Structure 1
Amino acid sequence: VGSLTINEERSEVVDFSVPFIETGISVMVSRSNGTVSPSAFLEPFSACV
């Protein structure tokens, strides 16, 4: 009843039931502080006027 998935070499040896929950493989990172926006948002927009 442990929280384990299968690969192809598990499934020949072990015999799962229907999967009750779904999960996947992720990575974990942390936050940054701020974003890039080089003072040019309306600069091509207002250039039309």
Structure 2
Amino acid sequence: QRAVMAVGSLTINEERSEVVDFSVPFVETGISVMVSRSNGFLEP
């Protein structure tokens, strides 16, 4: 009860779903993998 509203980059998770309540999300995101790009006869 230190704050009635929390705003930030808080990812919606199952654990936080029942402990606290959140409104409709405005920006979608999720799990992603970041990796450096690798370099790379009239047939086709």
5+ residue gaps, structure 2:
1-6
TM-score where L is the length of structure 2? 0.67
Pairwise CA distance, 1:18? 0.5
- Larger helix proportion of the pair: 1
Give the root-mean-square deviation of aligned CA atoms: 1.9
| In structure 2, distance between residues paired with 1:32 and 1:5 | 31
What is the count of residue pairs matched by the alignment? 38
Moved over 4 A (4+): 41-44
Q: Which has the larger radius of gyration?
A: 1
